From Swiss-Prot:
The N-terminal domain has binding sites for ComK and ComS and probably for unfolded/aggregated proteins; the C-terminal domain interacts with ClpC. Homodimer. Enables the recognition and targeting of unfolded and aggregated proteins to the ClpC protease or to other proteins involved in proteolysis. Acts negatively in the development of competence by binding ComK and recruiting it to the ClpCP protease. When overexpressed, inhibits sporulation. Also involved in Spx degradation by ClpC. This is Adapter protein MecA 1. It comes from Bacillus subtilis (strain 168). The lineage of its organism: Bacteria, Bacillati, Bacillota, Bacilli, Bacillales. Belongs to the MecA family.
Amino acid sequence: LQFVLRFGDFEDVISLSKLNVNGSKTTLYSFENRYYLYVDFCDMTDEEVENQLSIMLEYANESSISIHRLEEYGKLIISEHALETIKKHFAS
């Protein structure tokens, strides 16, 4: 299933990325001073997903902010492989 997670600041996004929990597809946006990770676990198991989500939620909170909201009024930063891209250029 799909999730939009909100981060209070960029460092927490970088922190998450270092964890190698880049849960299949992730797209990253900014909006109103915060960062939003669109997170698609498309095909994973209800187990891999549970432990994955739960770490993501140490650095973020579940948001009701719609992906369409973000698409038209947010800045798209990275699509599809966001956490991997952030880890590569920002992590460590």
